Amino acid sequence: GLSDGEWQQVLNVWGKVEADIAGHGQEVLIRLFTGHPETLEKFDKFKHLKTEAEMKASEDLKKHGTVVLTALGGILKKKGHHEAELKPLAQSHATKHKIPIKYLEFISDAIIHVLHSKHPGDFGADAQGAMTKALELFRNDIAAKYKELGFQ
């Protein structure tokens, strides 16, 4: 649950992402894959990537980064009223991709890391607080659907 002022911070930060969605999406996935190499094994189309240089050179990884952040941005713009947008993603990630909630924690922290890396000194403590709360809400509502499905 976020206040109006917190949502305003989230959507202000998101403007930074929308200026370069592919570059942000690429770096988020690279941070996930290099920090948590077990996550790469869930992607049949990226498991061939052995080095970060190959990851950086992969145009399909940048494409998928655009898909991921476009979906997340659509959810964030609903300011919590995201049941219709979130349900299909919860279902596909639990039942088809088999993504444990832990990996959603990993990618949430990766987003925070990338924002500081690309905007050092321009991602203030209030903005980090609000973005963190928004990603916690996203993860918590996914977790509720995971529990319904019995997925661990």
Ligand code: HEM
């Ligand atoms: C912010 C969190 C995430 C968002 C918004 C997101 C979004 C998406 C979307 C929109 C798709 C394509 C449609 C679909 O299959 O539902 C997708 C596919 C997929 N996601 Fe995610 N995802 C997220 C996190 C993760 C994480 C953490 C993992 C694994 C560590 C993951 C694994 C996958 C896989 C394996 C696919 C299929 C890729 C393919 O072969 O095309 N997702 N995701």
